[PDB]
Amino acid sequence: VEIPSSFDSRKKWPRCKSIATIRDQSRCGSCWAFGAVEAMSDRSCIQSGGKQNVELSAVDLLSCCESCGLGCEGGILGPAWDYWVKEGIVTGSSKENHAGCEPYPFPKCEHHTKGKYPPCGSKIYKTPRCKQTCQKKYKTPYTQDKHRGKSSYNVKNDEKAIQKEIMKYGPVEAGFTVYEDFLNYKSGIYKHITGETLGGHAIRIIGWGVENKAPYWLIANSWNEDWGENGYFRIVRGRDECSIESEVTAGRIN
Numbered sequence: 350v351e352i353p354s355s356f357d358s359r360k361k362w363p364r365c366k367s368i369a370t371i372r373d374q375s376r377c378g379s380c381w382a383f384g385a386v387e388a389m390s391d392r393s394c395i396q397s398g399g400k401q402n403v404e405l406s407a408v409d410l411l412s413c414c415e416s417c418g419l420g421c422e423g424g425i426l427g428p429a430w431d432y433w434v435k436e437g438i439v440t441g442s443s444k445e446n447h448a449g450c451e452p453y454p455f456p457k458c459e460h461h462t463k464g465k466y467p468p469c470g471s472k473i474y475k476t477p478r479c480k481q482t483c484q485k486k487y488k489t490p491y492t493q494d495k496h497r498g499k500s501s502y503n504v505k506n507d508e509k510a511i512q513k514e515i516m517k518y519g520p521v522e523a524g525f526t527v528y529e530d531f532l533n534y535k536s537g538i539y540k541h542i543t544g545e546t547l548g549g550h551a552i553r554i555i556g557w558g559v560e561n562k563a564p565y566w567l568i569a570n571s572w573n574e575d576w577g578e579n580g581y582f583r584i585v586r587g588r589d590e591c592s593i594e595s596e597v598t599a600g601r602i603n
């Protein structure tokens with residue numbers, strides 16, 4: 350297929366409201382689970398023609414997946430997508446909206462940036478317990494609120510392959526190496542210039558563009574709407590910047 354010079358999943362599939370939703374992982378290293386349930390929510394809606402229009406529970410995946418790593422201390426993408434295929438994930442929104450089966454237990458906080466929420470700080474929550482119970486007001490039993498995928502896969506470490514996957518099947522999850530200067534990001538096209546590694550981060554790629562001849566990926570972060578560009582950031586595209594093209598994972602419902 351011919352790849353357009355820009356693409357925005359929010360513009361292709363505007364009925365799928367999850368695609369334009371920015372979440373907040375709070376005082377928890379649950380980026381791996383947020384990028385997963387966000388892209389899964391998007392792809393569930395896109396690949397079902399808008400029939401499965403849901404917000405999947407970050408806390409269900411975070412608390413119940415035994416193979417996904419260390420919970421709030423960080424996790425692993427492949428096993429998150431396998432969990433969705435095999436066990437599936439219930440619905441659940443933010444602490445503040447408290448919709449769906451299992452809403453997130455942790456409140457919105459600022460991630461090394463200024464704004465209207467309390468600062469996240471340096472102290473981490475304990476990983477929540479796997480409770481397998483829908484909130485009292487939600488009248489579907491937990492097991493019957495599960496949304497499952499059919500397949501999960503890593504995407505080839507090829508710019509055009511990543512672009513074709515996003516354009517055909519929807520937003521993808523992606524890992525990258527976070528350096529200290531990423532914490533100073535306010536706007537524009539990020540590339541690593543200063544600072545030491547802080548480990549890995551997992552995000553959702555929703556599209557791509559070019560500004561002043563500089564190509565970028567358009568990415569949803571899970572640090573609330575005050576961070577970056579109303580919750581989004583852009584990062585150099587085509588040079589495997591911070592390994593952004595090398596840890597892409599996704600999957601399909603059919």
Ligand SMILES: *[C@H](CC(=O)N1C(=O)C=C(OC)[C@@H]1CC(C)C)[C@H](C)NC(=O)[C@H](CC(C)C)NC(=O)[C@H](CC(C)C)OC(=O)[C@H]([C@@H](C)CC)N(C)C
Nearest residue numbers: 378379380381418419423424426524525527548549550551
């Ligand atoms: C989510 C990313 C994140 O929340 N943060 C940052 O990247 C930087 C931050 O603030 C300075 C925040 C909050 C932290 C201070 C806690 C999450 C921490 N990252 C991960 O889960 C990544 C995801 C991949 C796909 C990039 N993976 C890891 O951290 C892995 C997880 C284990 C289970 C393998 O852990 C490590 O890389 C590492 C070792 C266990 C490696 C043998 N540690 C735990 C950093």
Ligand code: NA
Nearest residue numbers: 575576577579
């Ligand atoms: Na901002």
